[PDB]
Design a protein around this ligand. Structure first.
Ligand code: CLA
Ligand code: CLA
Ligand code: CLA
Ligand code: CLA
Ligand SMILES: CCCCCCCCCCCCCCCC(=O)OC[C@H](COP(=O)(O)OC[C@@H](O)CO)OC(=O)CCCCCCCCCCCCCCC
Lengths: 122, 51
């Protein structure tokens, strides 16, 4: 609904992207003689995997799951950019601005902490 | 006086202090097992059970 700050504050929902109804599965007509724009792009990570270091013999590195330690601070939001219609018909989003980065620290088995700049800049 | 090699014979006809000695022994063994695993965990590298 149209909630308010006071409704949301301290619940963790500020780090959540909006959702569409399970019944919302139509289609947006695109119009070559038009110009488009993403007015809001929101990205909310749910899982962080980090490639383990396979030893000098190696065999193959897998992506191992990690533990988030930096709390509900991880989401990209209020990202804007124009949506061109290309000539082969494809569409291209070109990020202009937004809160497009979050520093995140996850932890690996054995206590290795791995910081990273979760981002989509440019 | 008792000789050094006989001090622990005071427990022979003293069932409670025998039990107290036996408890202390048991404390030191379990203590050791605790300590030994802690030092093993602090020095064990578990990144390669192959080599
Ligand atoms: C469950 C095992 C056990 C138990 C409960 C006892 C108990 C006893 N023994 Mg016996 N004994 C044992 C095993 C055992 N013994 C074994 C395996 C041997 C062969 C080595 C002997 C050989 C032996 C002799 C030759 C004599 C006794 C005597 C005694 C009595 C007095 C001991 C004393 O005051 O020590 C005093 C001891 C000290 C003040 C210091 C000893 C320091 C030693 C050398 C090294 C310590 C290492 C360290 C603490 C780690 C422990 C070792 C590890 C195995 C756990 C006591 C009733 C004495 C006795 O008959 O008295 C009438 C005696 O003369 N014992
Ligand atoms: C399981 C261990 C154990 C137990 C339960 C007993 C129990 C008993 N002893 Mg024996 N005793 C032991 C080991 C043990 N003793 C050892 C190893 C020795 C050689 C030192 C003796 C020598 C001894 C004597 C000479 C006498 C007793 C006596 C007694 C009685 C009274 C306690 C006392 O005066 O303490 C005395 C014993 C101690 C205080 C032992 C202290 C040992 C310390 C903790 C060693 C620590 C070393 C070091 C810090 C290790 C750390 C790492 C290092 C690298 C820094 C009681 C029956 C007395 C008694 O009534 O008999 C008539 C007595 O006169 N004991
Ligand atoms: C109901 C009968 C009963 C039960 C269950 C036991 C059980 C035990 N006795 Mg035996 N004992 C009995 C009757 C009994 N006793 C009788 C009638 C006598 C003649 C008086 C003895 C005399 C005797 C001697 C002289 C010694 C024992 C010891 C032991 C213990 C040796 C193993 C040990 O410490 O493990 C390791 C222990 C644990 C992992 C944890 C034990 C925790 C338990 C559950 C106790 C909890 C508190 C409880 C209310 C205290 C009473 C316990 C019970 C022994 C009466 C064991 C728990 C020895 C002992 O005390 O060794 C330290 C010892 O030296 N007993
Ligand atoms: C089944 C295993 C077992 C058995 C049967 C015993 C039996 C005994 N231990 Mg215990 N103990 C055990 C496991 C065991 N322990 C474990 C796993 C730990 C922890 C690692 C301990 C830690 C421990 C401590 C800390 C002490 C004992 C003590 C005792 C003795 C008390 C009775 C006494 O007066 O001895 C009379 C003594 C003897 C009969 C001589 C025992 C000789 C043995 C075989 C060792 C031989 C010499 C030794 C290797 C030299 C070490 C030198 C080193 C500095 C380089 C007895 C011999 C106490 C003791 O000996 O007090 C005096 C004592 O202080 N034990
Ligand atoms: C935390 C860990 C704690 C560990 C505690 C350390 C262990 C405690 C001390 C143990 C050492 C005992 C030494 C006692 C020494 C001792 O007092 O001996 C003399 C002693 C005499 O005993 P008696 O029956 O005369 O009693 C007199 C009393 O005063 C004894 O308390 O005899 C015994 O101890 C019997 C064993 C003889 C021991 C034979 C040793 C001979 C060595 C000489 C040869 C040297 C080598 C050279 C030749 C190449």
């Amino acid at each position: 609904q149209t909630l308010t700050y006071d409704d949301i504050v301290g619940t963790g929902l500020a780090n959540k992207c909006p959702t569409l109804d399970d019944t919302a599965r139509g289609a947006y007509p695109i119009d070559s003689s038009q110009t488009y724009r993403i007015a809001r792009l929101c990205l909310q990570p749910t899982t962080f995997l980090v490639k383990e270091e396979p030893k000098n013999k190696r065999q193959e590195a897998e992506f191992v799951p990690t533990k988030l330690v930096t709390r509900e601070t991880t989401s990209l939001d209020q990202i804007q950019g124009e949506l061109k219609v290309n000539s082969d018909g494809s569409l291209t989003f070109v990020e202009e601005d937004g809160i497009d980065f979050q520093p995140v620290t996850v932890q690996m088995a054995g206590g290795e902490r791995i910081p990273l700049l979760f981002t989509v800049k440019n | 006086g008792l000789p050094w090699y006989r001090v622990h014979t005071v427990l022979i006809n003293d069932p409670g202090r025998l039990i107290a000695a036996h408890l202390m022994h048991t404390a030191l063994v379990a203590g050791w097992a605790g300590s030994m695993a802690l030092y093993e965990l602090a020095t064990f590298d578990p990144s390669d059970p192959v080599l």
